[PDB]
Amino acid sequence: QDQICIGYHANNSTEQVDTIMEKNVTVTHAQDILEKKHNGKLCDLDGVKPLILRDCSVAGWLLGNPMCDEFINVPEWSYIVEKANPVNDLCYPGDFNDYEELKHLLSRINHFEKIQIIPKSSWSSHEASLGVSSACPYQGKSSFFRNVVWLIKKDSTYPTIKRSYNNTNQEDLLVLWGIHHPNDAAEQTKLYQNPTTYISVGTSTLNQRLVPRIATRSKVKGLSGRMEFFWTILKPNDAINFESNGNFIAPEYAYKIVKKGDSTIMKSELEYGNCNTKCQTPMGAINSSMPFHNIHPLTIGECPKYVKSNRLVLAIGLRNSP
Amino acid sequence: QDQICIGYHANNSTEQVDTIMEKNVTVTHAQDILEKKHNGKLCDLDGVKPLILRDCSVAGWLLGNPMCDEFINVPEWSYIVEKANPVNDLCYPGDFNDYEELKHLLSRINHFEKIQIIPKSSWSSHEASLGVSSACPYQGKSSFFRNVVWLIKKDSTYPTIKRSYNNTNQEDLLVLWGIHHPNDAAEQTKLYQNPTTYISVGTSTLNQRLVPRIATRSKVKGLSGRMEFFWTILKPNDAINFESNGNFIAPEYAYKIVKKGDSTIMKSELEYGNCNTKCQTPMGAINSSMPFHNIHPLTIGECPKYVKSNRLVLAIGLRNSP
Amino acid sequence: QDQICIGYHANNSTEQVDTIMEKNVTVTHAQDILEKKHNGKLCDLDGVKPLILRDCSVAGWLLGNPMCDEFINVPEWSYIVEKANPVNDLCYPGDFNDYEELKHLLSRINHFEKIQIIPKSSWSSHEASLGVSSACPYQGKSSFFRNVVWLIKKDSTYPTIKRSYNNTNQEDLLVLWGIHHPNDAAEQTKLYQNPTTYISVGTSTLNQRLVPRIATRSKVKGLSGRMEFFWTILKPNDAINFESNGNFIAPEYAYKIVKKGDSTIMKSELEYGNCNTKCQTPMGAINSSMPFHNIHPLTIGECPKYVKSNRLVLAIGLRNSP
Amino acid sequence: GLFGAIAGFIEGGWQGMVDGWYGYHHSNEQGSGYAADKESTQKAIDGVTNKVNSIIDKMNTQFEAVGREFNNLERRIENLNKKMEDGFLDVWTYNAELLVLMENERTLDFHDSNVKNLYDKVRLQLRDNAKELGNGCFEFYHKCDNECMESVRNGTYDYPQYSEEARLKREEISG
Amino acid sequence: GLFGAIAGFIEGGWQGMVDGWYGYHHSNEQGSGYAADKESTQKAIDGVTNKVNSIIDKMNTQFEAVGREFNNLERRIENLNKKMEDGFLDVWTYNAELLVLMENERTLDFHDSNVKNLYDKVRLQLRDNAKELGNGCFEFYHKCDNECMESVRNGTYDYPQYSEEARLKREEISG
Amino acid sequence: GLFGAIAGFIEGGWQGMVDGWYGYHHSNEQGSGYAADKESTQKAIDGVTNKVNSIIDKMNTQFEAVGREFNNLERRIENLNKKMEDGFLDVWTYNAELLVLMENERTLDFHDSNVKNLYDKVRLQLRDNAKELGNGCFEFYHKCDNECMESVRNGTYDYPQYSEEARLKREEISG
Ligand SMILES: *[C@@H]1O[C@H](CO)[C@@H](O[C@@H]2O[C@H](CO)[C@@H](O)[C@H](O)[C@H]2NC(C)=O)[C@H](O)[C@H]1NC(C)=O
Ligand SMILES: *[C@@H]1O[C@H](CO)[C@@H](O[C@@H]2O[C@H](CO)[C@@H](O)[C@H](O)[C@H]2NC(C)=O)[C@H](O)[C@H]1NC(C)=O
Ligand SMILES: *[C@@H]1O[C@H](CO)[C@@H](O[C@@H]2O[C@H](CO)[C@@H](O)[C@H](O)[C@H]2NC(C)=O)[C@H](O)[C@H]1NC(C)=O
Ligand SMILES: CC(=O)N[C@H]1[C@H]([C@H](O)[C@H](O)CO)O[C@@](O)(C(=O)O)C[C@@H]1O
Ligand SMILES: CC(=O)N[C@H]1[C@H]([C@H](O)[C@H](O)CO)O[C@@](O)(C(=O)O)C[C@@H]1O
Ligand SMILES: *[C@@H]1O[C@H](CO)[C@@H](O)[C@H](O)[C@H]1NC(C)=O
Ligand SMILES: *[C@@H]1O[C@H](CO)[C@@H](O)[C@H](O)[C@H]1NC(C)=O
Ligand SMILES: *[C@@H]1O[C@H](CO)[C@@H](O)[C@H](O)[C@H]1NC(C)=O
Numbered sequence A, B, C: 001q002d003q004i005c006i007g008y009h010a011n012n013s014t015e016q017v018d019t020i021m022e023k024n025v026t027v028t029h030a031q032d033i034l035e036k037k038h039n040g041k042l043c044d045l046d047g048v049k050p051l052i053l054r055d056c057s058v059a060g061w062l063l064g065n066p067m068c069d070e071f072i073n074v075p076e077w078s079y080i081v082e083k084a085n086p087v088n089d090l091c092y093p094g095d096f097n098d099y100e101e102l103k104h105l106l107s108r109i110n111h112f113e114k115i116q117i118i119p120k121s122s123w124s125s126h127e128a129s130l131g132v133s134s135a136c137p138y139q140g141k142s143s144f145f146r147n148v149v150w151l152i153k154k155d156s157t158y159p160t161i162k163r164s165y166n167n168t169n170q171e172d173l174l175v176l177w178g179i180h181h182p183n184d185a186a187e188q189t190k191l192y193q194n195p196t197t198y199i200s201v202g203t204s205t206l207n208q209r210l211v212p213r214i215a216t217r218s219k220v221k222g223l224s225g226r227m228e229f230f231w232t233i234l235k236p237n238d239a240i241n242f243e244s245n246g247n248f249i250a251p252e253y254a255y256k257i258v259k260k261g262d263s264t265i266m267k268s269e270l271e272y273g274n275c276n277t278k279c280q281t282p283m284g285a286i287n288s289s290m291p292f293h294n295i296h297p298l299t300i301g302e303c304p305k306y307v308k309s310n311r312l313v314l315a316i317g318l319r320n321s322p
Numbered sequence D, E, F: 001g002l003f004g005a006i007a008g009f010i011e012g013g014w015q016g017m018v019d020g021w022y023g024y025h026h027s028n029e030q031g032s033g034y035a036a037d038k039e040s041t042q043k044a045i046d047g048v049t050n051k052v053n054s055i056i057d058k059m060n061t062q063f064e065a066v067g068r069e070f071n072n073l074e075r076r077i078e079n080l081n082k083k084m085e086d087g088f089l090d091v092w093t094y095n096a097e098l099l100v101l102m103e104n105e106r107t108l109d110f111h112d113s114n115v116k117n118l119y120d121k122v123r124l125q126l127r128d129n130a131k132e133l134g135n136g137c138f139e140f141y142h143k144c145d146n147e148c149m150e151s152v153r154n155g156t157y158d159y160p161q162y163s164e165e166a167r168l169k170r171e172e173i174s175g
Helices: A058-062 A099-106 A185-191 B058-062 B099-106 B185-191 C058-062 C099-106 C185-191 D005-009 D038-057 D075-129 D146-154 D160-171 E005-009 E038-057 E075-129 E146-154 E160-173 F005-009 F038-057 F075-129 F146-154 F160-173
Strands: A003-008 A030-032 A042-045 A080-082 A094-096 A111-116 A133-137 A148-150 A161-166 A172-181 A199-202 A207-210 A226-234 A239-244 A248-251 A253-258 A265-267 A272-277 A279-281 A313-315 B003-008 B030-032 B042-045 B080-082 B094-096 B111-116 B133-137 B148-150 B161-166 B172-181 B199-202 B207-210 B226-234 B239-244 B248-251 B253-258 B265-267 B272-277 B279-281 B313-315 C003-008 C030-032 C042-045 C080-082 C094-096 C111-116 C133-137 C148-150 C161-166 C172-181 C199-202 C207-210 C226-234 C239-244 C248-251 C253-258 C265-267 C272-277 C279-281 C313-315 D022-027 D032-036 D130-132 D137-140 E022-028 E031-036 E130-132 E137-140 F022-027 F032-036 F130-132 F137-140
Touching: A003 F075, A042 A279, A058 A099, A094 A099, A099 D075, A148 A172, A161 A248, A172 A199, A207 A226, A226 A239, A239 A248, A313 F038, A313 F075, B003 D075, B042 B279, B058 B099, B094 B099, B099 E075, B148 B172, B161 B248, B172 B199, B207 B226, B226 B239, B239 B248, B313 D038, B313 D075, C003 E075, C042 C279, C058 C099, C094 C099, C099 F075, C148 C172, C161 C248, C172 C199, C207 C226, C226 C239, C239 C248, C313 E075, D005 D075, D005 F075, D022 D038, D022 D075, D022 D146, D038 D075, D038 E075, D075 D130, D075 D137, D075 D146, D075 D160, D075 E005, D075 E075, D075 E130, D075 F038, D075 F075, E005 E075, E022 E038, E022 E075, E022 E146, E038 E075, E038 F075, E075 E130, E075 E137, E075 E146, E075 E160, E075 F005, E075 F075, F005 F075, F022 F038, F022 F075, F022 F146, F038 F075, F075 F130, F075 F137, F075 F146, F075 F160
Parallel strands: A042 A272, A080 A265, A094 A226, B042 B272, B080 B265, B094 B226, C042 C272, C080 C265, C094 C226
Antiparallel strands: A003 F022, A003 F137, A030 A313, A111 A253, A148 A248, A161 A239, A172 A226, A172 A248, A172 A253, A199 A207, A199 A239, B003 D022, B003 D137, B030 B313, B111 B253, B148 B248, B161 B239, B172 B226, B172 B248, B172 B253, B199 B207, B199 B239, C003 E022, C003 E137, C030 C313, C111 C253, C148 C248, C161 C239, C172 C226, C172 C248, C172 C253, C199 C207, C199 C239, D022 D032, D130 D137, E022 E031, E130 E137, F022 F032, F130 F137
8 A cells, every 4th residue: 555654854963962951962963153263363453454562562662672673664553462471671671650551552553653753962961872771782782772862961960951842743642751760879970960850741731740769679680770661642732841850761752643442452472364354362363253152262353252162052953863 | 514613813913023933023912122212301310319510520510610600509419410521620720639539429429518617718827819810710800719729928928837627517528629830930939939848638547748840831721830639538526637838729618428329420411301210321311111221321220231232022912924 | 431541740749930921830849049058157268268367457467466366377378358347457557558459469378478587686776676656555565566667766866777688588578668657847856867768668670769748637546647558579589678767667577478369358257167168158158059149249269150039949840730 | 833733724813803812713503703712812911921021020120320430541441341331231132132032932832832722622622523624623513503612612512412413414424 | 831731631630640750540440540651751850850950050150259359449440340240140130030930931841741742642542442531531432451551551552453342332322 | 852753653764865854755656755845844944044043143242352451460450350251251151051952952842843743734634535554654545646645745635536535445444
């Protein structure tokens, strides 16, 4: 006699799947919802290249740390890549004021341009040529940060500096300067003449007075003295006013800045790979369609949700028990 | 012949509904779970009016910015509404110390009472009425903050001021004061005899000594001078001690404060609407029954969960297939 | 006639369960997913005891507040328990710099060992035994913090102190010191001699210069003077260099520290209970197998997810209709 | 769908019925008409209304104030708050959307199940007193006046009262 | 519920049955009694236990310390922390509550389905050799000794073996 | 599972069928073979693909940057951020895992439901022109050529065209 039968598909699939009530259910077809794949590279973020600092910290890069790679015209970036512990930070040991907020500010920049603001050759009443250290060599000879000037007494006096720069540019600019904190009154007298000394800086926003701090300290890179750095954003058509009787680390170069967005500083040993994404990870970029991933927490961009699992498999086919 | 048939309801409904496996499913009845409605008004939060400073910053309001409100007496409020950029902040240019924390403190207040703590008529050894400026105009005439006093030398002396106030009230009070930072020694001398000057403020908790910073600065409202403000909370039965040989911006009025809760500062261009809610939004209030809303992230009160969707429709009826 | 019947289990169970569509459905068996039970005790975290300060704050304990119980040093702890308002904090009134960050640092410690770094018997040119106060009473007699030394002029001079300690240990050590703020210049001269005074502290990282601040203040424990404390972490093979003109509260004892993890400070009135857990609460420890709990928000350890419900009951059996 | 009823053996729903969600359509000697099965309809209404009330009421809402209180040298903390806000928004959006999808499916399937249970209720009452047309409809082997049909609805239908009538009435048709 | 069995055509469960969750009650000349269907009961137990254990074990728990470490001049940051904590409390509360509700409904319906499939297995075995009383019980048109019912449970019931006798008693009872 | 079909009255699936998920196996004079039910296979596929795409598309993803920007005197804020990150990971992990479990179960139950509804489609098409073997197979009481079986699959099977022949062979063998 003749017959018709209803039944269902079956195959060679070893693909398993879990269920609220059942485990290891072999199935016809399945799809992993968890993304686990990256390209192992650092890439542009949406067609905007990142700022890749090699052995330089942000400080060392902004200031002209001579042991750091020579400066590159890079007008635009989406995020900054630093290594975990850059070898070249401050050649002359010291500190950077409000450094993290500056790094955050600089994490993503729409326009950036190094600009000469006060020529080293215009400090006629002071020594602008001896402010040099073996800890900061340039071309084998002792030197110093390249965008900033360490002023010394000329002949045997340190006349009171009064100097100002007006931002005649059409963009905000980041201005950097510093104090030297010497070890003793002898060193103080030797470098400047003046024993009790100050540096005051004024802006439509800033009203600062820095006084160096003489103190006996441990040697760091053979030096016990310290350099302390400061910064501001000078508005267009605004001016900055420096006055100092000593210990002044004066500006020479500053930076035109345009900010339209924020990102962060990414810590990565990877290197650029001529690439574009919407999700960058320290281990590589992600071409992101999946709703979840398990690559790395510290991401920048439009990424899947980071999750702690090794597999998220959705059953699409049906039970397959051969 | 006889017949019985089992079937189900159907109608004229056009309401669609989505399903995990099917889209655009026409249905008998449905209920939106997403709230989208506001009243376009600023309202009380649980029967407590908000503090609505119209064109004044919190600073301009606390200190007596003459262009600000004839003192908006509000003994009690649930939140503070400021505009995005209030025209009236500090008439005399400068800064407010720990300002944001102060605004947060003042965001929600159970009792607030302005009280005279040091009468202007008690400055017998100093001129207490010339501390007036064109940057702080009232009615075309030069003036100053109304709750704070700009003390200037009388004749040609500024004797050392020693003053103390004991909080005999049963409530904490907010005390405000300031320093003037002049541009030059000439201005310093003209305003105050003494060239080297200080202001010490003492409390059972506070131990402050401020020194003016004379420095060349850019002009703000035509001025290069600066006003820097400071504040504390004086506990009952505690006293506050001011000592100064110059540059003192003294208290006259202070504020009784009782705090029982916290909120935040809301930025809105709107105006009061004689109204009550449990959920306020910068765009308007929410009469909240739904569990989700898409009005605005920056809300105050007991609000639905903010969500980025245009509709959350629950099927209650059944398929209505035409 | 003969009969076969299909049916299901039933019993006397009174356990109810709620359902998305039905409430108070009596059921055969059920399992509560919400944890509600604690042991009412303070316990170890992974077999590591907490540091339980009974009536001393972390400050009072670190500095040697004589009113604090002198107990057996605890080289290791997983978290710290303080009371909400400990009776013994700073015996001599004042402040502690970066105090919350220090408490956070000390919240979980792998090794802690008190160490003498500058013997009291080595201050031969100053009085190291008159630095004593009624606000810091020991055995009914006036005293001072025990790990720190209040140096006063001897006869009628205060020679400039220059002192250094080189960490010859293999561990970082926490070093503490302080400044004294007198009420007036008369007291300044009376205690020290020199009128204008400083304290400089130097490290491979620290560059500090403190100046006392004269201010008229309210009396706290009968005193208007103030003590201000400071700390650092001294790396192995680094040295700390103190120089002082007066007003120096010098170190005597410092602390070897090893940190490998972080926790926090817990506020609890409870007591140790010779007990271990992986989840501690201020109200007691939790034996955590359930995924949710409703005991207390402020937990330390591997805890269930805190939730605001009285009941999370899962149906395992079936409907039980009487 | 899941129970094979609504978009299955019952090809279509009834505009005619108004009294409820699920019901009966009869045609006998007295005429035709619709009548909604009240009990099961009420059960469905209570269940769905309870579902919605569960989606709404289990929501815990407490006072929160937000919130832009940081200055331009606190933008790291500002970003921390941004990540917090956006994170919570993503959580709530995804959960709400998916909740709506899953529960919409469950609701439709609930109606399906209800209808099937009704058809099977009737099935169990009549048995061989009627032919299952497979249409969701029953072709009666006997006379069923209105009062006969309400007992199908009442659930009080006596099968023996017609068992013989149907017998004769059946093999006469069994040509 | 969804499958119309447990609180549907079967009004009530059996205190008498103890050996399992789903089972049978027979009564013949040898007497009456219960016997629980071992297999489906164990399947159900493993499934519900796996459900609960999955709801518990999928929880990721890591070490956290909380946490009131901010002073009275850092109250904005404390507020950020508060918004975070309360946010998580809200998420976890809503999700836990609704999860318990939904999975409870699913569990009850799971029981319903199991019982119903049992009933249908028997139904398809007996066919017209017995009458569906609509209570969940079957009335045999023939004699069924212990071994025979023992074959009803086995799924090996011989329908042809009794078809003639059953037919006899059916058309005999049929007036 | 829930509807008792796939791993129930149909013990096993067909390696032979390749063109779809659910289908038919015929055997007549022209020979035997497999043929998949177009409609139900496509509907099941559309529903499942829609499920996966719903689980994927409802995710809100916005730009975020993270993020270790605090110094060694900002470790309380660092801890706060840690509690936030860990909280979100815990939420997304728990929800993703449970979503996958629950929705996988529903998917399998969906296949079960589909197959059962197919069996009922054929069953309702032929009725008493064929015998239900209870194996998921139908034994034709008549001649069914390829056009006839393709008309069973089509949902176009003509029952009157065979009612009498089947009637004859039924009253020949069904007793
Ligand atoms: C910085 O320099 C610019 C350009 O010299 C100044 O801008 C001018 O300001 C003067 C008043 O000093 C106005 O009368 C002009 O109209 C401005 N010129 C233009 C075209 O912008 C600016 O004032 C200076 N800023 C400071 C702080 O000195
Ligand atoms: C503020 O004023 C009050 C009143 O003079 C002071 O409180 C009194 O102090 C004296 C001496 O200590 C006691 O005899 C009174 O009993 C106190 N009264 C109260 C209500 O406290 C208080 O000491 C003053 N504030 C300061 C900083 O000393
Ligand atoms: C602290 O004392 C140690 C012990 O001498 C110093 O470390 C030594 O420095 C000398 C050179 O002056 C080396 O030859 C030794 O090998 C060093 N020992 C070690 C283990 O480093 C150290 O320089 C002192 N620290 C300071 C800042 O004074
Ligand atoms: C401006 C100046 O004086 N530079 C000199 C410094 C400093 O005196 C101290 O080293 C600072 O700490 O010392 C040198 O030996 C050096 O480091 O190369 C020589 C150098 O010319
Ligand atoms: C080192 C020292 O001089 N201690 C003395 C102090 C100080 O004068 C003040 O405390 C400083 O402000 O005053 C005492 O009355 C006290 O507090 O018991 C006596 C004590 O011997
Ligand atoms: C379930 O499947 C996974 C994948 O192969 C395997 O690791 C695990 O041991 C399996 N469990 C059992 C009991 O089969
Ligand atoms: C669903 O319906 C909307 C109208 O509300 C229509 O615009 C849209 O194309 C439909 N979506 C799809 C393609 O399923
Ligand atoms: C459910 O039971 C609890 C405890 O007996 C009771 O508080 C509540 O009123 C009940 N709910 C309903 C709807 O009866």
